[PDB]
Subunit: 481 residues, 3 copies
């Protein structure tokens, strides 16, 4: 008797042609588990900003004083709406761009470039209530609010030749008052400007005085801008009022660039190739469905709940008419493989598997499952991008495209599972119909072929004769009836 | 005798291996029909701008006075080149952005915020020939052209604390003259400015006086800008010349955001989940090819003329398993109660049918679809970006086409073979019952060596043949 | 006597993979991955590239004196720049909306330089302005295409100039603003101090103020020149007005276009060939749906894939000395001797041995495999893309959107094409298997009684089978007067 395997499994797969088909074995290829943790990424921690905006951190909001601050990070953790941004109300030009620039960094060191001391001739102690330090009027630790000394504001000049050996991120500001009287109180002079130069940059701001609602009590604003100073290049500042000067610069070496992850949680010291806001993924499968906003090298994100490839055969405690066919059902007793024999022997009967054809099948199904997994390229993407109020169009271009790929990968992967499942079942069917044939063509005359996949022997068949058939050696002196 | 179905069908499908193969049955999965109509979208009408640009509508070009104007729309209809834009020649900063913002809205109400009356101290009646109303010099209904009263233009001040309860779209302008003499005629003062403040916004414009060609007769221009005032926030205006002030604001609640559809036609009161400039699509198929510029939840747009899945079997009036068009040479037009039968096996016709039903569903149902706008807006200095969009839409067009074309072809070859296997299997089931008792003819017939009356014949269709026969 | 059904075999050591096996030697194959260029840069659809040598588009247009002798054609299809052209803005500066201008100029139907505000006519201002940095044979010179307006005597009267665009095509006009480092350099050149540079057309309205500021020296100058551009519509007028610091255009550029393409970063030079699809390593003259030459193509190209080989199997498994159990199955091995097709017979009898091929079923199979290989190739849409885009320093986010997307498509096409080859390979092998198991059956059902079926795909005849009887089996005509022996 020739037959196939069967077992306690209630696992269901779909094919193109049927659904809810119970199968002896399966392998889900949809990665759906995270570890609830935020982790290092390829051996390097994230910059952890707690509830500080990258603006507060850099500018040095006094409320950011005690942040981790590492010399090298791989992504950046912000909260969605950090609260601690520009304590003195304002704005920051090309902000989203700076954030992408800082998102990943090889080395990042703060360095004093235009020391506060040296601004003799101007007042340096300027501060506002809104940036309070223990109930005391303070200011952005990293900047210098240049105001009038006595009743005089001589041209302000300062420069810095970038010798540090790395490119440097320098940030500066312009103060916009609400009053041509606040303008005099601080700067005396009225028609002022704030000029800034390097080998590549040339900007000249004029203060824009204008009535404005109060934000943190102030109606005035401070407008910050930035630039990268190349190695061996010089930044030149010159103002006759309203300059907010940098005290420090930031050595910045990089790297490859990444992206910002919007989360509440905190670094937990683990390791992952692929980080998501719900947790890291340590996986090898080509698809996942944890969360869309990953950072690292991830499987393709898909809108699926399950992608269950069938590996084993139909479970029956096809296209070649054998499994669930002329061989009506499977054998739970044969457990040493997928296909096998049973024989009726007067010395006793039992369950022997064709290991030769179980090896073939198994090596094939292994290869199928590998094909599907290994041909899938994966590279380091950031996925979550930053956009301003005047970039909705662009933000949505990004969205239309991420949505575009979501649909491709879902349809393709869903169908891939279904087409390949119907193939597996049939492969198992063909393997059994072929075994049945191999056997049949050895016997012929000498057996009544029962039609349920059994052969009744017309002669005596002792164990040696039975192994002769599993051997592929049946031959063949018979005799009878 | 075992055999398969046949019929009058001349419908052709392709497979990977053959082409132009006549099949008993087929199901095109390419949606290629619209209804020539523009319709509501998910129960909500489009904003219908006629031939008004969003700039004219908002600014209130007098030529836009009588527009539909609904409190909630789902997309926006403009003509390609609306003609009625900035009747007083100029420009509008961040325009494309404003249009995307207005493309879809949950609630949109105009509201008077800085009433014309209250600008005592300045002249308010300013108008130009170019914005004529019945041959009469007029202006943007929604704005206030502040000029000098007598020979004096005192600082202009105005504010508005946004109490409406929704976020508000406020628009303002700056006038650039062509003459330091036009500049005096209207404003007296020469070194003027136009300052604007909110919690988040802070802008100060200076008028740029400069000789310029005439557009609508004027060489001067008006440069408009906008902002969204948050709830409970205040906008502050202050000018010493050249301000074009808003009279109204726009309450604007939204929503989800959509896009603008460039058409000539008009809303016809129907319903659709998916609108295209040629008409709406009421379809369930995963692919269409009506038009690239859809809005809504649509099938994937493909560069195909037909995607015809084969559902029935090869039509052979008079495969991979050697039965259909094989040892059983041709099909039977006589057997019409199913696909396979004797001389129909409803049991195996049901199996087959349920499978082919599932095939056709698999292909249709696994296709995700979501609300996309497709048609985007770009300025003259955004060609690079516009073309990024195009390279990508092109990118997806190629994927979906290649994939869907191949998908049809791979799955067709499978269907034919599936039918072939179904028949070779029927043939076998029967054969293994008879054996001895019949000469197997080889054309799929069995000649009985004994007598086979109707009960004996049902015994074979039953699966019950058994089996007292000793005849030769 | 005895007949025999079998399949083809040969000297081939070509391996394909399927979903189920790998490294499977096959009689025949067809790689569908285009991996060869011709090391050359070519015309594109019958039109040359603009060849900038080592000039930036800024230097070329502005007319850096170091760009004087460039090819300059009236119509190009893409643009060749070197990566870092060296000859850019010889007088240090910047150029607004530069990346956009480059995309605009990347492909052009007609492009003619035309003198619009002739140098002569700026009576009242000095015109000979030059700088050491733009030297011509050791002589202080300037951008050939611009006019450095400075003071005459000690007076700089308002500068005015206009041009009504009559040329008949849209015109690319470029202008500049000079930013000095000194309210003393500002006086030396322009006398006046609170100056401006105003520019107007039907659509454009810009007013620049010079920004004076201490700055590092670049090419020795601390001052800078900031250029901007616009397109003047037909019949429209550009108005210039300045009280100092204008760098005026002498020429305009008639520009008709077209369709727009992109810029190719290369070192080599145009070699006069032809290609529908150009890559920085060379042109591709191919018809296959995928290639892997280089990502930065321009023209109509196959989909770029991360593959080394995409080898479709066309012929059958090679077995010198499947899913239907025939090939590499009950018919244990293949025949190198049968060379007139894929499947055939061996018929042995007292008139000779000798292989026949079943040409009927070899034609079927071959027409099918031909169609397979065409399906895969022909259903692949292809259109004109540029692929290589231009982005400024403040556009890194955008540049990377482009990258994430090109990367997005790279993964789709690779996974899909890799898998496509594998799924279809397993289908071909099986298809050949089925063709043979079917031949074996067709034959078997004719014979029956009259032969011992050997089980290795041979039939030993129980009667005499002369050549006519053998052709009767290949014919499909075996019939059938035999009652030996028995």
């Amino acid at each position: 008797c020739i037959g196939y395997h069967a077992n306690n499994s209630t696992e269901k797969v779909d094919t193109i042609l049927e659904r809810n088909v119970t199968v002896t074995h399966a392998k889900d290829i949809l990665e759906k588990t995270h570890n609830g943790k935020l982790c290092k990424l390829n051996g390097i921690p994230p910059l952890e900003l707690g509830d500080c905006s990258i603006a507060g951190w850099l500018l040095g909001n006094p409320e950011c004083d005690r942040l981790l601050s590492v010399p090298e990070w791989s992504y950046i953790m912000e909260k969605e709406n950090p609260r601690d941004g520009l304590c003195y109300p304002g704005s920051f030009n090309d902000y989203e761009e700076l954030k992408h620039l800082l998102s990943s960094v090889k080395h990042f060191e703060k360095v004093k470039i235009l020391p506060k001391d040296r601004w003799t001739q101007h007042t340096t102690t300027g501060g506002s209530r809104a940036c309070a330090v223990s109930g005391n009027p303070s200011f952005f630790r990293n900047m210098v609010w240049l105001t009038k000394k006595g009743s005089n504001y001589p041209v302000a000049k300062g420069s810095y030749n970038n010798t540090s050996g790395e490119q440097m991120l320098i940030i500066w500001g312009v103060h916009h008052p609400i009053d041509e009287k606040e303008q005099r109180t601080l700067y005396q002079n009225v028609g002022t400007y704030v000029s800034v130069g390097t080998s590549t940059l040339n900007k000249r701001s004029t203060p824009e005085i204008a009535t404005r609602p109060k934000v943190n009590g102030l109606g005035s604003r401070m407008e910050f801008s930035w630039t990268l100073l190349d190695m061996w290049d010089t930044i030149n500042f010159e103002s006759t009022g309203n300059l907010i000067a940098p005290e420090y610069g930031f050595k910045i070496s990089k790297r490859g660039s990444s992206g910002i992850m919007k989360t509440e949680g905190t670094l937990e010291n683990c390791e992952t190739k692929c980080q998501t806001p719900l947790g890291a993924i340590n996986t090898t499968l080509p698809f996942h469905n944890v969360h869309p906003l990953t950072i690292g090298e991830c499987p393709k994100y898909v809108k699926s709940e399950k992608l269950v490839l069938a590996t084993g055969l139909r479970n029956v405690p096809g296209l070649f008419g054998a499994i669930a066919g002329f061989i009506e059902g499977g054998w739970q007793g044969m457990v040493d493989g997928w296909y096998g024999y049973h024989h009726s022997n007067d010395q006793g009967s039992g369950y022997a598997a064709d290991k030769e054809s179980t090896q073939k099948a198994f090596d094939g199904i292994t290869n199928k499952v590998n094909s599907v997994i290994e041909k899938m390229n994966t590279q380091f993407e950031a996925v979550g991008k930053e956009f301003s109020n005047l970039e909705r169009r662009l933000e949505n271009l990004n969205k239309k495209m991420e949505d575009g790929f979501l649909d491709v990968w879902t349809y393709n992967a869903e169908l891939l599972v279904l087409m390949e499942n119907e193939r597996t079942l049939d492969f198992h069917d063909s393997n059994v119909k072929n075994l049945y044939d191999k056997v049949r063509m050895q016997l012929r005359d000498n057996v009544k072929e029962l039609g349920n996949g059994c052969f009744e022997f017309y002669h005596k068949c002792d164990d040696e004769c039975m192994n002769s058939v599993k051997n592929g050696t049946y031959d063949y002196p018979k005799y009878e009836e």
